[PDB]
C-alpha cells in the first residue's frame, strides 16, 4: 500500500493543487469582449432571462452543469471522515463526468450532518445546476434526502449509490436470465444487507417484473421476519415474510436463484452455493471483500454466473458505467427528474448492449476483446466507448414518452451522430495495450 | 439596441452555450491515471486532508478556489431579476477571476433571498471554497449578510458592492491630497447616497486618519443628519452630523474639500461646484450617469481633480481594478480572513502605482499611454498590466503582519517573480492599438 500511497498524493500536489480547474469556453484577449462578458453586455442576456425562465439554459452553461454533492459522511469505504475530507473524491467523479460525458461538475460539499438542513442548502441552490448527484451520505439520512430532494426540487436529482450500480445490477440479472431460460416469474431471489444499492436494486427488479411472492431479504439479524421487531418498517423490512424458523440464512439459501449480495462479505459459503437451484446468478458487489471469491464459485458449481465489484475476474459492476451517461441523456432531453421509466430505458440499453456487440474498429493486433456474449459477458465493460452512444439516446427517448423533458430534441439521428463525434476524440487505447501485455 | 442587445444575447452560445467550463487539469490518457484520481488512489489524498485539513490546500484546488454566491437582488443596474436571471453576470465575473488573477471560480446562486437563510447556506457552503466573493446583495441586507458571515467562516468573506469603490476612491483621495498638498488631518467630507457603496467607504477613509467629525453624510430626502427625523436609521448614526437646519444638499457644501456620491442621476450643478472650496475634489461614482458631467464642472473651476467611473475620461474607478487582485494575496497566503489592514495595504499600494511608473516595455509606437501622475492621473487605468504584482504581494505582507494568515510566503523575491511570469503569459495588446487608432 506504501507504493499505492505515495503514488497517488504526488498524482496532483506538485504540479498544481488539485485536479480540476476552471477555465473559460469564450474567446475573449481584447476590449469589446470584456465589454459583453461582464458589465454593460452581459445585462442583456439577463433580459432576456428574467422573462423567460427556460432561456437560460441556452444563454448559461446550466444544461450543462450538474452538482456532485456531499456532506463527507461516508465516503467511498472510508467512512464519516467528515466534510472536506472527501474533497477530492468528489472532484475525482466531476473529472469522470467530464471525461466520459462532457458534464461540467462543481464539487459542492455541504457541511451540514442534519438530513433537514441539508435538504435546504441544496435545495436553495436550484438556480446554480442543471442536475444533483448527491454522493457519499451515510444511510439512513441518505434515503430522506434524495426523497425530499426529488419531491421539492424541480431538478434531476439522482443518488449515486441509491441507483447506480443497482442499474447495472439490475441489467446484469435480466442477462443472466436471458443466458439461462428462467423466466423473471419463476425467479426466487435472496438479498443480503437491503440498504443503500441493494434497497433500489430490489425495486428496480420488482418495476421490471419480479414479484414480491418469490423475494425474501436477509440480513445479520436473519430474514425480515414478519414479528422480528414491533419497528415493521418499510425502508428495510418491507413485503416481509412470516418467521417460519429461518434463523440463519442456510435455509433461505436452498431453493433459491439470485443472490444479489451487495452488503455483508463473506456471507457466501461453498455449501451455501452448492445449495441452490439450476443456475445461480450470485452478485458479489462488495468493493472491499467480494461476497465470494468467484473460482470457488465455479468449482462447485461449473454452470453458474458470477459478478463481483472488481475487475479481477470478469462482469465487473462499476458505478462509472451509469451515471454520467444517465445525467448527459437527462441534460440534453432537458428533463425535470430522473423517474423510474428513464432507469428502465437504461437498463434495456446496458442489456442489448452484451449479446449486440460487432465491430467497432476491432484492434487488429493488441487488445485480446474476446468477447462474446456468455456467462463471462453478461454486461458490457467498463470502458465500452458505445454505452454513451446507447444509454443517453435511449434515457432521452424515455424523457420523450414521460412529458418530463423541456426541450425535445428532433431528429435522434443527429443525437447519434453528435455522441458518436464526441466518444471519436476520447479513446482510452493503452489499457488494453496494458491488458494484453500482462498476459 | 439591436447592434448591442442582440450582439449581446448572442454573446459566444453559438459555438458552445455558456461561458466557464470545468477542465480536468490531470493527465487524461491511461487507466492507471483513472485509477489515481477515484476509487483505489484517490482515497490516499483523504486521509491526510482528514489528519490534519490543512492538507487540502495541497492536494485540493481550495488554494486557488472562490465562489461568487449571491442572491440575485441588485445585478449590476438591473435590480431584482432573481437568482437564475443574474446567473450569466456571475460567470462573467468568474472568467474575470480566471483572466487577471487565475483564480477558479463557482458561480453559486442561492435561491433564497431572505437575508438570514442566506448565511446558513453560505455556512454550509464554507468546506468547498477558499474564499466568498458575495455580489449582489441589495442593501441593507448585503451588510448585514457580509458582517454575519464574516464573524462564522473561517475563510475571506469579501463583499463586492461595499469594498469595490471604498478602496480605489480611498486611494484617490490618498492620491488627491498628494497632488492639492494637503492632509487628511483637516479635509472636510461630503457623501452622497449612503448606500452600498458608500456607507462602508468613510470607514476606511477614517483608518487613513479623516476624523468623523468632517464627514457630513446626505440622502435623497436632503441630509443625513441626527435631528432630521426622531428615529435615526441605522449604520448612519456614527457619521450623522448634529442638527443645524440643514435640510438640503445645496447648502451643506460650506465650501468643502471631497464630494464622494454614491447616487443615481446628478445632484450638483455648475454652482453647486463653485461652493466647494479651492481643489474640488468629485467622486461621481454612478455608473450609467455622471453625477456632475465632468468636463463641464471642469470648466467652472479650473485645477479640479474631478474623479469617476466611466472610462471616457480619466480617474476611472472600477471593480475588477482591485477585487481579483487582492483575493490574489489571501489564497496566495492563507488568509483566514480579510481585515481592515490588508483592504488598506490594498489602498496604499495602488495609490502609489500612480506615480511610480516607468519603463515597462513601453510601446514605441501605438497605444499612446502618456501617463504622468497630475490632475489627471490619479489612480492605475482599469488593467495596468501591473496591479496584481503590486497588490498581492503587498496584501500577503499585511496578512502575515497581521497574523491572520496559515500559510506564510517566504522571501518575497519568489512571489514578485511568479506574478510577473503570470502578467507576461496575459497581455491585452489589441486595445491600447484600438484606443491609438480610433483618435
Ligand atoms: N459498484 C460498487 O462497487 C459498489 C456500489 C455500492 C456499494 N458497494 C459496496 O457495498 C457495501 C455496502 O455499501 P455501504 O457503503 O452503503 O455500506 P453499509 O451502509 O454499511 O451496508 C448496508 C447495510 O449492510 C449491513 N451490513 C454491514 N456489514 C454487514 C455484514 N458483514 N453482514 C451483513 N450485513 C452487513 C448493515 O446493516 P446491519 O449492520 O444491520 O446488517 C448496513 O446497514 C460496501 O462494501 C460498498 O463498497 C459497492
Ligand atoms: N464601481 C462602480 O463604479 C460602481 C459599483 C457599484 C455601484 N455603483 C453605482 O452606485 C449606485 C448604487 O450602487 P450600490 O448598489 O452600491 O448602492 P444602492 O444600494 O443602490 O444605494 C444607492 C443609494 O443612492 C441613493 N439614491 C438613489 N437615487 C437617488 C437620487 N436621485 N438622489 C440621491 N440619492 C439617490 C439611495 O438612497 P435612498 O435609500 O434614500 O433612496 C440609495 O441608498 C448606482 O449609481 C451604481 O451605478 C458604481
Ligand atoms: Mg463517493
Ligand atoms: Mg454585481
Same mark, same amino acid.
Given at each position: 500500500?506504501?507504493?499505492?500511497?505515495?503514488?497517488?498524493?504526488?498524482?496532483?500536489?506538485?504540479?498544481?493543487?488539485?485536479?480540476?480547474?476552471?477555465?473559460?469556453?469564450?474567446?475573449?484577449?481584447?476590449?469589446?469582449?470584456?465589454?459583453?462578458?461582464?458589465?454593460?453586455?452581459?445585462?442583456?442576456?439577463?433580459?432576456?432571462?428574467?422573462? $423567460?425562465?427556460?432561456?437560460?439554459?441556452?444563454?448559461?452553461?446550466?444544461?450543462?452543469?450538474?452538482?456532485?454533492?456531499?456532506?463527507?459522511?461516508?465516503?467511498?469505504?472510508?467512512?464519516?471522515?467528515?466534510?472536506?475530507?472527501?474533497? @477530492?473524491? /468528489?472532484?475525482?467523479?466531476?473529472?469522470?463526468?467530464?471525461?466520459?460525458?462532457?458534464? $461540467?461538475?462543481?464539487?459542492?460539499?455541504?457541511?451540514?450532518?442534519?438530513? $433537514?438542513? !441539508?435538504? #435546504?442548502?441544496?435545495?436553495?441552490?436550484? @438556480?446554480? !445546476?442543471?442536475?444533483?448527484?448527491?454522493?457519499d451520505i451515510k444511510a439512513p439520512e441518505c434515503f430522506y434526502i434524495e426523497q425530499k430532494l426529488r419531491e421539492r426540487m424541480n431538478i434531476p436529482v439522482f443518488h449515486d449509490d441509491q441507483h447506480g450500480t443497482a442499474i447495472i445490477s439490475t441489467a446484469a440479472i435480466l442477462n443472466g436470465l436471458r443466458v439461462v431460460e428462467k423466466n423473471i416469474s419463476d425467479v426466487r431471489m435472496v438479498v443480503s444487507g437491503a440498504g443503500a444499492a441493494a434497497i433500489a436494486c430490489m425495486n428496480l427488479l420488482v418495476a421490471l417484473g419480479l414479484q414480491k411472492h418469490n423475494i425474501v431479504v436477509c440480513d445479520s439479524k436473519g430474514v425480515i421476519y414478519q414479528g422480528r421487531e414491533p419497528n415493521m418498517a418499510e425502508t428495510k423490512a418491507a413485503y416481509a415474510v412470516v418467521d417460519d424458523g429461518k434463523r440463519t440464512?442456510?435455509?433461505?439459501?436452498?431453493?433459491?436463484?439470485?443472490?444479489?449480495?451487495?452488503?455483508? %462479505?463473506?456471507?457466501?459459503?461453498? #455449501? /451455501?452455493?452448492?445449495?441452490? +437451484? *439450476?443456475? @445461480?446468478?450470485?452478485?458479489?458487489?462488495?468493493?472491499?471483500?467480494?461476497?465470494?471469491?468467484?473460482?470457488?464459485?465455479?468449482?462447485? *458449481?461449473?454452470?453458474?454466473?458470477?459478478?463481483?465489484?472488481?475487475?479481477?475476474?470478469?462482469?465487473?459492476?462499476?458505478?462509472?458505467?451509469? !451515471? %454520467? !451517461?444517465?445525467?448527459?441523456?437527462?441534460?440534453?432531453?432537458?428533463?425535470?427528474?430522473?423517474? #423510474?421509466? /428513464?432507469?428502465?430505458?437504461?437498463?434495456?440499453?446496458?442489456?442489448?448492449?452484451?449479446?449486440?456487440?460487432?465491430?467497432?474498429?476491432? +484492434?487488429?493486433?493488441?487488445?485480446?476483446?474476446?468477447?462474446?456474449?456468455?456467462?463471462?459477458?453478461?454486461?458490457?465493460?467498463?470502458?465500452?466507448?458505445?454505452?454513451?452512444?446507447?444509454?443517453?439516446?435511449?434515457?432521452?427517448? +424515455?424523457?420523450? #414518452?414521460?412529458?418530463?423533458?423541456?426541450?425535445?430534441?428532433?431528429?435522434?439521428?443527429?443525437?447519434?451522430?453528435?455522441?458518436?463525434?464526441?466518444?471519436?476524440?476520447?479513446?482510452?487505447?493503452?489499457?488494453?495495450?496494458?491488458?494484453? +501485455?500482462?498476459?
Amino acid at each position: 500500500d506504501d507504493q499505492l500511497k505515495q503514488s497517488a498524493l504526488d498524482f496532483h500536489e506538485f504540479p498544481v493543487p488539485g485536479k480540476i480547474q476552471v477555465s473559460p469556453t469564450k474567446p475573449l484577449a481584447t476590449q469589446r469582449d470584456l465589454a459583453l462578458a461582464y458589465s454593460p453586455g452581459v445585462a442583456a442576456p439577463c433580459l432576456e432571462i428574467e422573462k $423567460d425562465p427556460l432561456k437560460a439554459y441556452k444563454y448559461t452553461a446550466r444544461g450543462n452543469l450538474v452538482a456532485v454533492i456531499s456532506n463527507g459522511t461516508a465516503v467511498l469505504g472510508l467512512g464519516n471522515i467528515g466534510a472536506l475530507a472527501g474533497k @477530492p473524491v /468528489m472532484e475525482g467523479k466531476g473529472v469522470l463526468f467530464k471525461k466520459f460525458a462532457g458534464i $461540467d461538475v462543481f464539487d459542492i460539499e455541504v457541511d451540514e450532518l442534519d438530513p $433537514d438542513k !441539508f435538504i #435546504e442548502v441544496v435545495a436553495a441552490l436550484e @438556480p446554480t !445546476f442543471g442536475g444533483i448527484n448527491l454522493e457519499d451520505i451515510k444511510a439512513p439520512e441518505c434515503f430522506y434526502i434524495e426523497q425530499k430532494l426529488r419531491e421539492r426540487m424541480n431538478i434531476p436529482v439522482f443518488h449515486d449509490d441509491q441507483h447506480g450500480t443497482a442499474i447495472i445490477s439490475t441489467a446484469a440479472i435480466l442477462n443472466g436470465l436471458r443466458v439461462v431460460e428462467k423466466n423473471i416469474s419463476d425467479v426466487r431471489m435472496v438479498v443480503s444487507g437491503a440498504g443503500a444499492a441493494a434497497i433500489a436494486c430490489m425495486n428496480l427488479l420488482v418495476a421490471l417484473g419480479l414479484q414480491k411472492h418469490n423475494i425474501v431479504v436477509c440480513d445479520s439479524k436473519g430474514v425480515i421476519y414478519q414479528g422480528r421487531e414491533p419497528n415493521m418498517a418499510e425502508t428495510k423490512a418491507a413485503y416481509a415474510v412470516v418467521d417460519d424458523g429461518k434463523r440463519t440464512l442456510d435455509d433461505v439459501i436452498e431453493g433459491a436463484d439470485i443472490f444479489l449480495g451487495c452488503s455483508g %462479505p463473506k456471507v457466501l459459503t461453498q #455449501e /451455501m452455493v452448492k445449495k441452490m +437451484a *439450476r443456475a @445461480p446468478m450470485i452478485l458479489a458487489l462488495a468493493n472491499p471483500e467480494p461476497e465470494i471469491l468467484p473460482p470457488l464459485a465455479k468449482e462447485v *458449481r461449473p454452470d453458474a454466473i458470477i459478478c463481483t465489484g472488481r475487475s479481477d475476474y470478469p462482469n465487473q459492476v462499476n458505478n462509472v458505467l451509469c !451515471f %454520467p !451517461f444517465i445525467f448527459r441523456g437527462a441534460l440534453d432531453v432537458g428533463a425535470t427528474a430522473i423517474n #423510474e421509466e /428513464m432507469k428502465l430505458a437504461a437498463v434495456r440499453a446496458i442489456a442489448e448492449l452484451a449479446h449486440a456487440e460487432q465491430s467497432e474498429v476491432v +484492434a487488429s493486433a493488441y487488445g485480446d476483446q474476446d468477447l462474446s456474449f456468455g456467462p463471462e459477458y453478461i454486461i458490457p465493460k467498463p470502458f465500452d466507448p458505445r454505452l454513451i452512444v446507447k444509454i443517453a439516446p435511449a434515457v432521452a427517448k +424515455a424523457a420523450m #414518452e414521460s412529458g418530463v423533458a423541456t426541450r425535445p430534441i428532433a431528429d435522434f439521428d443527429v443525437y447519434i451522430d453528435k455522441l458518436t463525434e464526441f466518444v471519436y476524440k476520447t479513446n482510452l487505447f493503452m489499457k488494453p495495450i496494458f491488458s494484453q +501485455a500482462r498476459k
